[PDB]
């Protein structure tokens, strides 16, 4: 889930 949402970055 992390990379699911730093994706942004």
């Known amino acids: 889930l992390a ?3 730093m ?3």
């Open 3 to 5: 990379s699911f949402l």
């Open 7 to 9: 994706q942004a970055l």
